[PDB]
Structures are given as structure tokens and as C-alpha cells.
Amino acid sequence: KLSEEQQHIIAILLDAHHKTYDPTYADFRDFRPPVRMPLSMLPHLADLVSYSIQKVIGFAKMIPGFRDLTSDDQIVLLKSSAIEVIMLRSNQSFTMDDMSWDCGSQDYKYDVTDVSKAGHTLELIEPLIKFQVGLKKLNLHEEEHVLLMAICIVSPDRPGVQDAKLVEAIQDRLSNTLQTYIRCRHPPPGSHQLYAKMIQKLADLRSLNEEHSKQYRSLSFQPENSMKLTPLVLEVFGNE
């Protein structure tokens, strides 16, 4: 069985996700409009990413144990993980019907071409879509989804981490919760090697983070493109 502490961890992570992920996508109306007709989708997608960063932070602050870290380490973990958690949380809007992120209306349905119109190439987008399909195919329980985001954030091996032992301690508590959850609550056959597959997804995310970082560096180096970003994106991802 799940211990009471493990049940507690899951309850808190579910609530945290519900408080930071609006499945109606109502706030998207506040973003600069999408334009499809260069880099025409950069203002909209920069605003989507900026908003998403704010939400990833709100979720992270609620991870049991996250508060016990120094603000320095909190910063390092959030800076390094932001794009990966956005990629993870985006799986909720992703649909394999047509390989797109469907956020409720034609205006807010993003396909491969929209992402390339934010300054990105297939070198990133092809593995990104393959990641999204592989992740969908795991048919994760919401419980597993929120634990995986939490484990993603509290990763002791991120560059610049000071108290790695404490970060590892918090991550182990989440990892063990996830393994026990799978054992007790995820029935076979769907549970077959499920934890190892979830961890492989974290590995894939590191490669996606690297390639995104490379393409973002190149994008943002052009002052006309960085003019289109937000102050939070520049602070988190880089300002040339």
C-alpha cells in the first residue's frame, strides 16, 4: 500500500497541478495574437512560454520539500528544468489525432509549422513530437504525470546545484512514491516497466533541453528577435 505520507504527497501534487494548469486555456486571450502568414508566431509563443514559466514556478513551490531548499538552489532547478516541464505539461494539450497541441480553438492549436515560425528547426521539433507521442502512449495516470513533473524539477544533477544531497533526498521521496504508486495502483498490463519508461522520458528531456537551449541562443542573439521575447523568458532562458 501507499503510506499515508505517500498519499499526502500525491494529493498535494494533484492540487498543485490543478491550481496551475487551466484545461480551458482561458488566459491565452491575454497573449499577443498568433499570426500564421519572418518568425510570425514568436510573439504569441513567447507569451505562451512566459505564462507557462510562471505556472511551472507556482507548481514547483508546492512540491513537498521544495521549500526546504535555498533560494539559490530553487533558482538553479527552475532555470534548468523550465523548458522540460513545459514540454511535459504540454502533453496534456497534445493530441495524436494530428500531432498538435490543441488548446481549445483553431487560433490556439499549434502544429509543427507554428513552432518553426517561432525560430525553431526540425532538429528540435522532430524529437519533440516523438517525445510527445511516446509520452501520450504511456497513458499516464494524472498522479504519475504530476510526480514526473515534480521529479523533473528536483533533479540533483542540474549544473550549479549546491546542496545535491538534499535535492537527491527530496527527489528520492518522490521517486519512491511513484514506484509504489505504479505497484499498488497501476494495474498490469499498462504498468509493465512503467517506471523505467518514465525515467527514459526524463533522459529524452535532457536532449530536448540541450537542443532548445542551442536554438534559443541563436534566436535570441538577433536583437530583433529578442525584442519579441518577454523579460521573464530572457531572465530564465538567457539574454545573449
Binding site: 510562471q54 507556482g58 513551490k61 521549500r67 533558482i75 532555470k79 531572465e235 530564465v236
Partner: peptide, 12 residues
Amino acid sequence: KNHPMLMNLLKD
């Protein structure tokens, strides 16, 4: 590094 916005959002 100076991350005033991230720092602000992290506040309790």
C-alpha cells in the same frame, strides 16, 4: 546571477 523576476515569483 541576478534573477529578480524568478526570485519574486519564488517568494512566500
